DNA sequence: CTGGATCCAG
DNA sequence: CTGGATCCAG
DNA sequence: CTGGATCCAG
DNA sequence: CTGGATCCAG
């Protein structure tokens, strides 16, 4: 990845907001890949499409890009409130890219946030624009990401440095199982991913997994069928291309 | 027209 | 954190 | 929807 | 039997 914008694109513009739109969307089109499946390039939706900047034409994941000069805040500016409210609840609800760029118009940080982390609760309605305003009565919104987990933020470029796309695809696919709250309970798929990651190396077996039985039992005290559950969860992780089934109780991390 | 889109600016 | 000024398109 | 339980190919 | 597939309850 190269980290600088194509400044020529914005010669004819005056608004720094509109310049940011052009420069950041061009950069992502030219330089980013699908953090879910690894497809490059992402495809750009048509202009004005609500909360819909890019799609991956391989896996159908959608992406909303939010960009800013400087540093991230937990509060993010957006578009129309009503259509945000509708898009976060859609079956094809978008994942969210966050991009920071420097005073030299180069990409400082670039991360993805899995889609489950932007919920209707996150979306804060703004006061309508005054009737003095050009867009009088427009109701915009801000997104409150304060509650998002540290681990939900998956960096593609971090403080100047491009990260390995395979580390990112791995982390994103794990991230899609991550729970909206620290207060929400354990969750099987998460706890099993946790065991998998405690196993050294790429290859493992069902017997390796059944060693975590006593540990899983403490967590899920009412589960009297732990082994069956381990097996069911491995099937879930397979269907998501997180592991491969080698046949008869043998697995490999992807 | 109306109603989406940008994030900047302070 | 809050309120706008640009842009874009059916 | 997800946690707990059941089924049966091989 | 063993491990992948499926069902049922709240
Ligand atoms: Ca955007
Ligand atoms: Na957009
Ligand atoms: Zn993809």
Author numbering: 1 to 254
Paper text:
The prototypical m6A-dependent endonuclease R.DpnI was originally isolated from Streptococcus pneumoniae. The biological activity is due to the specificity of R.DpnI for Dam-methylated (Gm6ATC) sites. R.DpnI cleaves its target sequence with high efficiency if both DNA strands are methylated and with lesser efficiency if only one strand is modified. We have shown that the enzyme is a type IIE restriction endonuclease and consists of an N-terminal catalytic domain of the PD-(D/E)XK type (residues 1-182) and a C-terminal winged helix domain (residues 183-254).
We present a crystal form of R.DpnI with one molecule of the enzyme and two target DNA duplexes in the asymmetric unit. One oligoduplex is bound to the winged helix domain as previously reported. However, the relative domain orientations differ drastically between the two structures [according to the DynDom server the change can be described as a 75°–80° rotation]. The catalytic region of R.DpnI is disordered in the absence of the substrate, but folds upon DNA binding and forms a standard PD-(D/E)XK active site with two binding sites for divalent cations. Based on the anomalous X-ray diffraction signal, we suspect that one of the sites (site 1) is nearly fully occupied by a Ca2+ ion, while the other site (site 2) may be occupied by a mixture of Ca2+ and Na+ ions. The site 1 Ca2+ ion is hexacoordinated by the side chains of Asp53 (the ‘bridging’ ligand) and Glu64, as well as by the main chain carbonyl oxygen atom of Leu65, the proS (OP2) non-bridging oxygen of the ‘scissile’ phosphate, and two water molecules. A three-stranded antiparallel β-sheet with a long loop (residues 75-80 and 123-144) wedges into the major groove of the target DNA. The hydrophobic pocket is formed by Leu129, Arg135 and Trp138, which are all located in the long loop that gets ordered upon DNA binding. It simultaneously interacts with both methyl groups: its pyrrole ring is in van der Waals contact with the m6A of the proximal DNA strand and its benzene ring with the m6A of the distal strand.
